[PDB]
Structure formats: structure tokens, C-alpha cells
Symmetry: C2
Subunit: 191 residues, 2 copies
């Protein structure tokens, strides 16, 4: 399989100010292109040469995993956002968040805390298991819930390249602002 | 002891453009300040409340280590640079680098490669053992060579906050430029 650099479903300046034009250009246009390019090179000659992306994340190790994990993480990341929304989840997912976390507000707070306290580079993920149970997963570096057999629903990138141009060291502020661009219709569809 | 935010031995704009004025403001002024403030609070009521930095780095774990390791790494990082220096190491260190790596140019290429291939946040360190044997250590996140009983001689920060404002994703270009601000008199003094 020759993995592709996903096409963004909105203009590069669509998520500003929370994710600026410049950040999208570097984050999607350079960092992700690199992860995709590296993944495609490393898998040739291995058992993952013709495997789907999810299988690679589930089974690979080392460099292949680092690039496969990052490719999947970013594909989910850029596709879950849209300008002018945010707000709150509804349907089956909104009801499940209320039941398991207490309320949407409490969920956001625990999620913000998980992302703020993750030391170094990584991702904070809302994931669901086979019985529909929700959990907040802290994933160092290239981690993704698919490695644990879980379904990734919403992931915030806390690698510094995701927010440094606009927020510098203010990661908690960036995380608080991200809720404003989450497209819950797309997230609910993942659940 | 009360751990201090280290006083810089030069003007805040002295390392520009390799480490710009704005980068020193955030990197030293915010990031390091946070590591030091957290270290001082976290050690209250622990076996480390009255230990020197080296001992905390050699024996702590968890959050105390994360902040103590980052404080030591940054104190060494900021104090090893100076404008109008750079060039090649001389004396004992210079000759040890030639003997172990063949030449200073080859050593820099190997050090640059280690810094470039370190996935995620971390440090690349030139360290020595009790008999002067040199090694290039890749330390993830808050890691420091004192943790394995070595002497930290030269360390480059590859956490993205160290270079993102000026270089964005061009980590390799940043690492090659750092050689130009290294004060070998100071590094030789550590050997
Ligand atoms: Fe990223
Ligand atoms: Fe740093």
C-alpha cells in the first residue's frame, strides 16, 4: 500500500486562531508529509508492506510504528475539526459522555488535565472499547488507541509543533481553545 | 536547598540568531522557570527537600525527576554557549574526540545524526566516564547522563520549544548552527 497525505476538507486558514494558517501549513504540509513519506519507505521489505494502516499501528514496532502511529493520529486530528462549531456532543455519544464522566463539562476538564499533564510529546485520546465504554488515554509520542484494540474518537496533539507558533508554552490555553473547533457530528460518527 | 532559575552569563539577545532573544525569553524565562518552581514545590516533605541537584537527578523518579532532570539539563545548556566562540575543541577533550571519533568533523556529523533521529522530545549528550571515555547518549524527555553515572559535557535540546520559533520543523539545521555558539573552553572544563 502506498499511503497518501490526506487532503484537508477546509482551507488552510479555516481553523484560525486556534490552529493558525501557518501552523496548518507546517503541521499538515511538512510534519505529516514527512511521517507519510517515512512510513512508505520503511515498510517495503517487511510484513507490513501490503497491510492496511490500522493493522500497521496494531502490530508494528520501532520506526515503522512511529510513522504509522503519527500518520493515523494526524489523519484523525485534521478530519475532526471544522470552523464555527464546537458546542456539545449529542445522540448516543453525548449520552455516553454524560453517563461515564458525569457531564460534558467534567469530561472536558478531565481531558484538558490529561493533556496538560502529559510530559513531553504525545496525544490525549477519547476512545471507546468493544462494549462502548469510554476512556481517556494518554499516549506518549506516536501512540494511538488502535494499538490497544480501542476505537479512537477524539485526539488532541500535545507535541509542541501543534501549538507553539501561536501559544508558545501555554499548552493548557491551546487545549481549552480546541473545543471551539471540534465537529461533534464527525466525532459522534466514529462512535 | 532552594533551586534557582540560573542567572544567564550573557545578554538575552547574545545568542541570536541561533537562539533568538524571543527564544531565550520563553525557553529560559518561562519553560525553565516552570521546571524550577515545580521542583521546589514537589520536593517539600520528601527525602530530597535538602539534597543537591545532582543527587535528585541520580535518585528521583516520576515528576520530581522530570523537573530535576530538566533543570540540570537546562543549566548545562544555557551555560555552555557564548557569542564569538565556536570553533574546535582543544586540549584533552579535543584529542579524545579525535581518538574516539577520528576527527572533530566526523564527531559533529555523528552527534547531529543522533540529535536528528531522536524521536519525540529529548536531549543529545556528549558524556564521559571515569577514565575519559566519550559517548554520545540519546536521552528521551528529561534524561541526563548523570543518571547512568556519566559526566555531562555537551548537550543539545531537541524538545521542539528549543528551536520551533526560528526553525519550525528544520531541527537538523538548528543542530548544525548550534556548533557556532558552543564555548569549548567551558565544555573542556567539564571533562
Ligand atoms: Fe502533530
Ligand atoms: Fe528545553
Amino acid at each position: 500500500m502506498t499511503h497518501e497525505l490526506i487532503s484537508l476538507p477546509y482551507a488552510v486558514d479555516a481553523l484560525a486562531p486556534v490552529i493558525s494558517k501557518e501552523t496548518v501549513e507546517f503541521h499538515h504540509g511538512k510534519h505529516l508529509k514527512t511521517y507519510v513519506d517515512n512510513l512508505n519507505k520503511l515498510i517495503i521489505g517487511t510484513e507490513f508492506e501490503n497491510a492496511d494502516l490500522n493493522t500497521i499501528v496494531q502490530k508494528s514496532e520501532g520506526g515503522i510504528f512511529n510513522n504509522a502511529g503519527q500518520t493515523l493520529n494526524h489523519n484523525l486530528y485534521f478530519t475532526q475539526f471544522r470552523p464555527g462549531k464546537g458546542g456539545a456532543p449529542k445522540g448516543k455519544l453525548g449520552e455516553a459522555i454524560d453517563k461515564q464522566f458525569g457531564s460534558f463539562e467534567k469530561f472536558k476538564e478531565e481531558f484538558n488535565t490529561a493533556g496538560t499533564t502529559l510530559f513531553g510529546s504525545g496525544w490525549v485520546w477519547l476512545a471507546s472499547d468493544a462494549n462502548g465504554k469510554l476512556s481517556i488515554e494518554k499516549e506518549p509520542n506516536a501512540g494511538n488507541p488502535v494499538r490497544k484494540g480501542l476505537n479512537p474518537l477524539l485526539g488532541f496533539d500535545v507535541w509542541e509543533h501543534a501549538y507553539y507558533l501561536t501559544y508558545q508554552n501555554r499548552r493548557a490555553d491551546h487545549l481549552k481553545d480546541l473545543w471551539s473547533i471540534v465537529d461533534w457530528d464527525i466525532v459522534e460518527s466514529r462512535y
